[PDB]
Amino acid sequence: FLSLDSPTYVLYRDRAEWADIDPVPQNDGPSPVVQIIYSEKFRDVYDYFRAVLQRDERSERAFKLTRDAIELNAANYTVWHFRRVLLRSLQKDLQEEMNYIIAIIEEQPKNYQVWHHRRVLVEWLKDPSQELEFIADILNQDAKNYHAWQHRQWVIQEFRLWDNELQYVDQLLKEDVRNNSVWNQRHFVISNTTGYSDRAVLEREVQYTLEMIKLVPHNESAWNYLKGILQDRGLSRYPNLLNQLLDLQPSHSSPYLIAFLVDIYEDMLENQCDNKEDILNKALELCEILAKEKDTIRKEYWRYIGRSLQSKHS
């Protein structure tokens, strides 16, 4: 109703409808620490909020008061909790609250309390029809917003909305193949639907990733995904992979590729392969290439990895 910046705004202490309530002030005692100074307007709203809270007043006026308290500080979780209590007590229109929270989140997409509030609402309504589109809008202003991706995974899992996510992922990877959040989403969708045990799926995915790597060879995300879906099956069990990678070294080289190769050679050594002492040298050779010229910032790490390989296979 009465906006905090309206020319005709009136402090709560001067409103007739609030004359019966005694405001409750905050007191930090004798020597306050990390004390924040508050304006008259701010302190006024919260002095009445404390009053209403202290008496657990489930009134319509209290509900309107929370709107102001939230405008002054959307990070106050107690205010949001109380607002939810009131939402229930007064049996308020939840579809309206969805509009409210939708606006708030757009203005403060990094606030934990607002995302939690929206999730509680969606649970209450058991209605996820608005979710995927809302999240896509937020992800459009910030494609890596952790809160947004988290909410998205919750919605999809809770209401089983897997049908179009893999397509959404393909779309975003085209917009920015370096977005680590989207690669994570891809693995989220696949491992929760078809899984990777279907050789046809694994092949589709390994092929897809190599295509993306060829487009932008220096992308940790793509390489991590590729290694991720194969590491547990056993990298050494894929002979054509080793050769296809070795064929990329010429042009599409990068520290990620070199590392992958080292990880492949190590898997081999781990599986009593043929030419143990020869494979080990191919690995050590790469570790040193990484340390001395390809990933120098990790110089000491790679040398450390190398020393580890020797003392383990000799």
Add this chain to the structure above:
Amino acid sequence: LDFLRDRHVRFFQRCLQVLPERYSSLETSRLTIAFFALSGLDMLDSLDVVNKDDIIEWIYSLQVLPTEDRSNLDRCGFRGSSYLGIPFNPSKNPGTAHPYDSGHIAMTYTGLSCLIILGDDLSRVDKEACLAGLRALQLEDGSFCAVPEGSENDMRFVYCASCICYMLNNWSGMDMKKAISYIRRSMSYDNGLAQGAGLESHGGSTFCGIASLCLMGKLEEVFSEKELNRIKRWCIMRQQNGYHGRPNKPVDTCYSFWVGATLKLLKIFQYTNFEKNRNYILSTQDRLVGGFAKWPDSHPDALHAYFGICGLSLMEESGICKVHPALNVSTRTSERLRDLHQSWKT
């Protein structure tokens, strides 16, 4: 360039004093701002510039004590501030019932942590009440919430629970088996740890997971050597010069601690590049007002000032105490806590 030690000491002093209304959104978490400043001064060996006694009383006024009828145990711990309007009471008289008054896991954690840093012995802490409150916060999947009324749940709070149990030297505050399960299930296909199962692995949550396991003394037991090697690989890949929180994201000073401390716990921080890390951290130093920012030419804040300093500490910056990588306090403070634990054991 160089470390402006005195400037940062003044910066932290100001944090404990009075803040402009533009910081209103920090009201409910003033206690952690206090933590950053106090632990920051401790890290710089300057706790003398503050009145340890005044602050200890303030902290104790934030403890949610059980009521006469002890019917609010599931809500005990510490508040982030006095925004509820409850009359000042430095844990003297019993608890005064209030419909919405309860602790917040991150505040219970920073609160106890602050008390120890200030030299208090925790005798005024209702240990059993805090642990009771802690247990109430754990969910079926093993993770924790911040408040009994309900909130988001993730790795951050698992770390808080771990720190609390560790400081109160009593793990009855959590179902360790379920917590460990949660931590395992958060490991991503790329080998880092995320906020929860299926989510994108992140430097912050990886620290929380690994540090929690170290505090429980079960790192080795939970992850195989192969697994720990994969995690180490993920973590050390975070360094660009300074450290970023996740692949393909810009570096931020605080990760010098989050990721750096994880590497320290995994015993391979020694293999990282110190100079580039130090240079980045210092480039985010505010030479005028003190403190550090996330990025160079950015505004400083208590959190990045504290973690930038802890990051420097990892490499033994001249003039900064050594930080305890898992407990997030100075080794000095961790040592004092060991003594404190011993004295109790009598």
